[model samples]
Target chain A: NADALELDTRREIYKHIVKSPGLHERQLAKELDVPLSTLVYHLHYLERRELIMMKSDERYARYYATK
Target chain B: DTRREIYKHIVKSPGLHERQLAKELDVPLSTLVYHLHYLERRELIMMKSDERYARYYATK
Candidate 1:
């Protein structure tokens, strides 16, 4: 999981997403103790790389490991 | 500024809304909206839109 990621934040994030599978953004922030915005930046960049994909629904957009 | 933070959080933590996002994240609601709107416009993230305080979600 961490093999594709470089930053500790991204590595930690990837792991969480993998575990939770359908987790939303805020939940990950709370769980990881990282600022919500900080996670977003990494998520954006990380997503741009296609490491993860989001499944949007009625309320929350759940994330899943894609790569 | 705050969009990406809003993104990944929504990515894992569903059921959380905008106001609470600011409250818990220490981000101002307006700032959160600014970033949230940006992300929405880009189709990078999405949320349930309707009456009063909709829920937020991430987009693939």
Candidate 2:
């Protein structure tokens, strides 16, 4: 499973999302001070774990805790 | 002011709310939110949803 990954950067991102709520990708990128592409890569890993959900509003998409 | 102090509070408390941290740290909720957001991105603290109340905790 995707959750089996090591303490790499993506796993670190998942751990953060799992703990925090109401944080979107931009906010997350800003918080982590990472490039958008890097954040997206980590987000994909978390999505594979079924641990987070992304909701697309008309303007921007927001990420939330799913598991 | 130090990362150790921040880690100490987060790790010792387990789950802490932004408002609670604000009250404890004698800072505005916005400032607390800013730092919490920063720590969260750093993966030092995790955020959980409670609908009625949001919580934060140290994460491995």
Candidate 3:
């Protein structure tokens, strides 16, 4: 209801995407500096929030902020 | 009963932070975080960052 963004890692992830568009899983993993397995968890977390949506081209999965 | 209780709990306490919720309600906090994180993923509730220990609000 007020201004707040939870979780250090979650914000880092969201803001990275905010600062860059069409960010994919591999780059996200690198930028956020978490292991691939961990990225998968937060990726799905943000996707579940509907804060982001994902797509792909060939092999890479891209992410973009929804709100 | 789990998510439903968590949801209602957040609605009543908008700033219900991690561990705070689990401790007050008496469950394993990490498990609660997973449940809450998953709920957040579904857009069932809204999560606002408090850095390392964020809070959640019921979606309106």
Candidate 4:
């Protein structure tokens, strides 16, 4: 639901994806300065909610906003 | 400072009254009002003033 933005961390992650599609998890973790575990957790939530989608390229899992 | 904190709460619960925000965020009423004005001024939030209080909501 739209309530996915209830957490500011998730909201910011979604915003970044909206602005720059095809960003990988490690890149997001480093760029946003959030811990890998925390970033992965939110990414999983966003993906499950369909706010974002993950695409596999070689070994890299790139992320993009569903919008 | 507390701007994002205020926005996050308002977004979580739209139509939150100004006083309610102060109480929930545990900030001084005056300080809360200042951020409220800034949020509305920035168009990140909209304020609805009716009878006894002003309620806030996040903008689309």
Ranked by TM-score, the better of candidates 1 and 2 is 1
- Recovered share of real interface contacts in candidate 2: 0.00
lDDT of each: 0.65, 0.58, 0.61, 0.65
Q: Write the per-residue lDDT of candidate 3 for residues B1-60, one digit (tens) a residue.
A: 876677777776666556567867786867777777677688777644332222122122
Arranged by lDDT, best first: 4, 1, 3, 2
Output the number of the TM-score-best candidate: 1
**Candidate 4 lDDT, A1-67, residue by residue in tens:** 5465348788887788877676667778778888878887887787777777765442211111111
Model 2, B1-60: lDDT tens digits are 844455567676655665665666677766666776676687767666432222222233
TM-score of each: 0.43, 0.38, 0.40, 0.42
Give per-residue CA lDDT, model 3, range A1-67, as digits (tens).
Answer: 3234437777777767767766567677777778867766776788789777665342211111123
Cand 1, B chain, TM: 0.69
**Runs in model 4 lying further than 4 Å from the true structure:** A1-6, A59-67, B1-60
How far in Å is the alpha carbon of A21 misplaced in model 1? 0.8
Q: How far is candidate 1 from the true structure (C-alpha RMSD, Å)?
A: 14.5
Tens digits of lDDT, candidate 2, A1-67: 4445434667667767766765767777777777878777766656666666654432211122212
- Model 2 TM-score is 0.38
Give the per-residue lDDT digits (tens) of candidate 4, residues B1-60. 687788888776776666677888898989977887777677777754332111111122
Candidate 1 chain B lowest-lDDT run of ten: B50-59
